[PDB]
Amino acid sequence: TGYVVEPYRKYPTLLEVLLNFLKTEQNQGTRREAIRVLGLLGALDPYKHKVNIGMIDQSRDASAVSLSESKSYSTSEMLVNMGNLPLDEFYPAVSMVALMRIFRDQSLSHHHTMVV
Amino acid sequence: VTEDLSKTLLMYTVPAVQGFFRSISLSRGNNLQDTLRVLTLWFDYGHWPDVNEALVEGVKAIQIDTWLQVIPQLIARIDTPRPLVGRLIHQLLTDIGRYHPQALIYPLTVASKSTTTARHNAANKILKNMCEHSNTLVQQAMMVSEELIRVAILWHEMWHEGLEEASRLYFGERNVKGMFEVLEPLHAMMERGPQTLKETSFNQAYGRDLMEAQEWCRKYMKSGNVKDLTQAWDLYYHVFRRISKQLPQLTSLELQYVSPKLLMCRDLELAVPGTYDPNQPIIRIQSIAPSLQVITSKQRPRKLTLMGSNGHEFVFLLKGHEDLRQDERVMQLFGLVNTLLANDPTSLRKNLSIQRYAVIPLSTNSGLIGWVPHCDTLHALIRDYREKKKILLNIEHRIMLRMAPDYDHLTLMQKVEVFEHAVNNTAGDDLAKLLWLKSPSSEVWFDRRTNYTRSLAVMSMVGYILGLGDRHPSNLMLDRLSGKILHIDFGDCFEVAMTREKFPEKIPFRLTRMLTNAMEVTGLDGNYRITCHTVMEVLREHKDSVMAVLEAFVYDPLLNWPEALNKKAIQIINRVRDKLTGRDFSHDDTLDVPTQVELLIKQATSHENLCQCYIGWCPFW
Amino acid sequence: VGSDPVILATAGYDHTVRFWQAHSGICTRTVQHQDSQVNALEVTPDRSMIAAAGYQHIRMYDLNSNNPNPIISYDGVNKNIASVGFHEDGRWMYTGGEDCTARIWDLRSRNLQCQRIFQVNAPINCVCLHPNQAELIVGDQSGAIHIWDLKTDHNEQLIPEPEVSITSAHIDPDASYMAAVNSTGNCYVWNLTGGIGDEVTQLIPKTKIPAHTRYALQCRFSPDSTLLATCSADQTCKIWRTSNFSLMTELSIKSGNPGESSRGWMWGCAFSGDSQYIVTASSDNLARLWCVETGEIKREYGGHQKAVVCLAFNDSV
Amino acid sequence: PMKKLHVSTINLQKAWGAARRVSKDDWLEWLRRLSLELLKDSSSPSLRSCWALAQAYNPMARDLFNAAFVSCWSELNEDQQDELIRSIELALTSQDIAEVTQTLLNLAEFMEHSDKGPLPLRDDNGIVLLGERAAKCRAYAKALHYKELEFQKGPTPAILESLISINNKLQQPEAAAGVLEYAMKHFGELEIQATWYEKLHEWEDALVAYDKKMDTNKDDPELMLGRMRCLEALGEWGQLHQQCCEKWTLVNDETQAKMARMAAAAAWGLGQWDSMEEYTCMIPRDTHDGAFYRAVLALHQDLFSLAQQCIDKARDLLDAELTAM
Ligand SMILES: Nc1ncnc2c1ncn2[C@@H]1O[C@H](COP(=O)(O)OP(=O)(O)NP(=O)(O)O)[C@@H](O)[C@H]1O
Ligand SMILES: [Mg+2]
Ligand SMILES: [Mg+2]
């Protein structure tokens, strides 16, 4: 169909999902197909990718009338948000974060025993 | 001569207006520059007939929502003497209210309470026109505005402020008539009577003493003897001590004590302040939280909360003692600068957008400030860093006191001695290590630091053009996600702090060593200086739009807080023109952007300029 | 303290003023100077009274009695006072302040306020007076050296370097050369004019002297009009020769170790009548007396708990 | 709570057994076993509870590798810590695999953030080692961080070289300009080399300098490579191909491998496909560049099947780099 580049904008999570596949799955064929899709969709400009996921927003930044925000993790991010408190409380925190990452995921139901 | 000049002006202006309206219609979103240019042409030549018909045709043809960009400027000339200009301003504002009342009600509410007669009656007329079709929204906005003003400063607050001012006046200035003038509004609100549980409690607690002081005042200007005045001062001192002891205990205000009306109203059709956008569904005030946190600062704002119609909380900081109109117009100018930086591809790629919040003034003394999430003041950031590292917060200051316990009392070069001793014996890398430590990964650290440096350069140059002073660490904030710098208080714009008698500021912007160390290790000669050059080029090329946005200060008394007022305003704008063009440092000479930026960086980095800064400015930081 | 023909005084941030003798090496007495620091010291020509200029007040100190308090604490200047200066008879004392006012008060009377005032656009750095006592060189923070006529109030102003802070100025007793020194580390020397009351007092500039790469603070001619001493903020003082403005004399207190830097500036200097011994103050708590010919530590005046700034030196046969 | 647990030291340094691990599969297995054994020997019961689930689900082991190492490391004494440092250094130095190197650098920066402090990896806290490892691992933000640590500890012209290189490979020409200005201010005495312009993306000046330096030294490897890089960047395919033809007959085979990439690019730009066939032979078949250029040659000769499995191999080889970056 030639529906290229646009899928990134209309599906901001598409590029993130495709890249995350490379981290998660191990099958070589699936990874090769993921790379094929990534190339076919185009090597998106990193600025355009940031715009798609909203990290950069000129609609609000350049808007004359400013708008209020609508509100009042990895192991490294967990440490950064947990560095104030000791390591003894960091270990259960990251343990529970990983355990819940697995546990919410229903596709790993066969691990939900051990997780609990 | 004059007639030929008028003919040339009209024949070069009417095509200008036509072309600008065509371009605005063809832009549809990226038209703030063109809208401001149209407003400048309309303000300077709208009264001319042909320009008037051209403007009427363009306004009729052009989409209304565009004008939402420039609501302040229009209201800044709502009271234009020229007949046709005022007529078209009023008609345009009426239309904007007819289709987009949400954006325009709040500025109109502010303008209604203007001391000026022309602005007052014009705002009243436009509010009546708004009411003619949206009486519900108009009265709702008025009610919530008045209630939030009431909550901004309690009867405690203004009585304490008035007593403080009277104490300075009678003992400092020996101005008893000034004391009476300052106190008359307080007696006026006493006559108004209590209207909320907090007001009734304050009445039952101190109103008898206040009326007794008023009685000795009556005796005073019925007889003219200072004995009655001192009798009044006795109870004034007693109530002042009582209120001063009570004030720290007001760490959190419950609405039903201070404003039950906010609790009565639910599921409102009014849009949340500073969230209306015609291209998106209108988020409305579903409810208001039952408790307002209060900060212990001198001005004592209130961390107010709203529950929006979309279910997401919207937090605001409610100020009662500052004029928020200046903050609003500075946010508008920051929006213009963001548009300019996005227009240029070179600066667009680099993400030089200025972080900004929503400012909603409610009167000439009170307003709401968008509470930016996930941000920390530079003072708070450094305080947390030094508490965590067991480093002592005021290490540089006490090093100065050790070298000179009378540090404020020295001559200039002796102050340079003390300041350089403090700087050279302290690492000054708190912000660099803190940006590194607050980053999940080196990728995020580098992104955050790039954004920090670029935003710091952008805001440095913009504030310099804006003459933004009082940039102490508590007035700077840093994002916990993007790393950009956010400037939050703009009560000293246009070099006001650079001319005050007490501790005048001698620097254009904050470029202390702690910031420069958080930059690239090679220093500010790279990312910072190049970004400053870029931003100065963008602003100097588009100085017309910056001046157009700043004309709001020319035709308003905002900078006063009357030909002297106009003289001062045109002097300030002349200074801003000198800054933009480059004739700031020497009037007889014009400087290219690299030279001007070098001079400004030297000025903001010079130890002679930094040492003279007031100590709480933390120049050593 | 007035017994010896040779006397010097020292002061700084320690809220005290100290007095020393040339060949003693130990403080004679310490007199409290609380409530403020001190910016300048000067012993009157007659050697009967010392003026200490600090913040918002000028204090007077006896020279012949035995450990008194301050005797006349002049007040009135709302902000920091920066300089002092006396007439030969000592009746009239000149001064300059940080509040853009250069003033001249009385000393041999009980007058509690100023006698003459003069306005200048910028705060006044160290001020000096022509030897004949009829003209005032006033150094402002804007770099504009002011020639002020005492008999006509004529205020000529010359700016040899735009937008810089001239720090000090001194004119030799012979009224031949005059020197000024600024924060750029430069010494500007101008020839005088042999006038008495002809209103000429023309100043003819000369070759610039790149004295320092760092803030230069105090430049003073010798009483014999033979040598000039310029002490700066790089912990260096250079003694230039008035004949040709050459130099073989360095006065440094650098430890030499990079880990022991920022030891302290040199804040002033004071030649002798013979002009072979020179005493300077150093913000590393200490005052040093050297000899120009050899440039070796002749004496060190220990005793100041905190840094030292200003010095005065008077000598007699 | 449940108190701590004894970190079995023997099995802990045994898990860091990079002595007889060579192939990529060996190193991935080493990383897996180490990440599991850290959880098994973790002092905190909270982490050790996750070991059973990690064993049957490796991504869990990958998630808690940093925290597991922190838990194991904080219990060891000075000597055991020193042994662990020596083995960590050996692991970083041994072989450059994107996955293992990425994990170890992530651990290094994690320890940098942690209150325990940076790992005393060498005399310089592994600043130089981690910096070069990040540089060649294609992870340039970490490389920038450690190079800036080097700069803070002391600035030298070589640190400025690497810092300009990193900043421009982060697409920061403005930061590179800043580093150049720092060099000119504090190192104006030295003559700025051609490599500076090459890394500053001042390709024209870099080429001018390389020509001015080559006339004094005929047939120098580094000079030749730099001149070719400048020519390729400038788009001067004709000059690049002339240089390739002129010098290909005397280049060392090891340096002929470096020649080959730019040679093939230039020949493609001109169209001497026999020359491309000659050059691409030297490019390894195990690199994405080699597979991609072999696919290009196959397509020019219209071997669509051959080009197809060549593109498949190119994707397979690029998978590791893409996953790491
Ligand atoms: N827009 C904002 N977003 C987030 N936090 C804010 C904002 N404005 C203020 N704050 C926070 O609230 C604190 C107090 O508000 P601030 O505006 O400093 O009041 P103030 O100290 O009375 N003003 P001033 O005397 O002009 O410095 C700040 O220091 C921040 O911590
Ligand atoms: Mg505050
Ligand atoms: Mg504030």
Residue numbers in the entry:
A (entry chain A): 851 to 922, 929 to 972
B (entry chain A): 1869 to 2429, 2490 to 2549
C (entry chain B): 8 to 324
D (entry chain A): 1254 to 1578
Provide passages from the article that reported this PDB entry.
The mechanistic target of rapamycin complex 1 (mTORC1) integrates growth factor (GF) and nutrient signals to stimulate anabolic processes connected to cell growth and inhibit catabolic processes such as autophagy. Direct binding of RHEB–GTP to the mTOR kinase subunit of mTORC1 allosterically activates the kinase by inducing a large-scale conformational change. Despite the fact that the receptor–PI3K–AKT signalling pathway originates at the plasma membrane, RHEB signalling to mTORC1 occurs exclusively on the cytosolic face of lysosomes. mTORC1 is recruited to lysosomes by the RAS-related GTP-binding (RAG) GTPases RAGA–RAGD under amino acid-replete conditions. Here we reconstituted mTORC1 activation on membranes by RHEB, RAGs and Ragulator.
Using symmetry expansion and particle subtraction to remove RAPTOR–RAG–Ragulator, we performed 3D classification on the subpopulation that does not contain extra RAG–Ragulator copies and identified two distinct conformations of the mTOR–RHEB–MLST8 subcomplex. The final resolutions of the intermediate and fully active states were 3.61 Å and 3.16 Å, respectively. The M-HEAT domain of the active state moved closer to the N-HEAT domain than it did with the intermediate state, with an average distance of about 5 Å. The FAT and kinase domains of the fully active state moved about 5–7 Å towards RHEB compared with those in the intermediate state. The mTOR–RHEB interaction is largely maintained in both intermediate and fully active states; however, the residues Met1255 and Lys1256 of the FAT domain of mTOR are disordered in the intermediate state but engaged with RHEB in the active state. In the mTOR intermediate state, Tyr35 in the switch I region of RHEB flips to the opposite side and is disengaged from the nucleotide, whereas, in the mTOR fully active state, the switch I region of RHEB adopts the canonical conformation of the RHEB–GTP-bound state. The FAT domain of mTOR is more engaged with the C-lobe in the fully active state than in the intermediate state. The established electrostatic interactions between residues Glu1581 and Gln1355 in the FAT domain and between residues Arg1585 of the FAT domain and Glu2311 of the C-lobe in the fully active state indicate direct communication between the FAT domain and the kinase domain to promote the active state. In the fully active state, the ATP molecule was positioned 1.5 Å closer to the catalytic residues in the C-lobe than in the soluble mTORC1–RHEB structure, aligning more closely with other atypical serine–threonine kinases in the phosphatidylinositol-3-kinase-related kinase (PIKK) family in their active states. Finally, the mTOR–membrane-interacting site is only seen to dock in the fully active state (4), suggesting that this interaction is involved in finally reaching the highest level of activation.
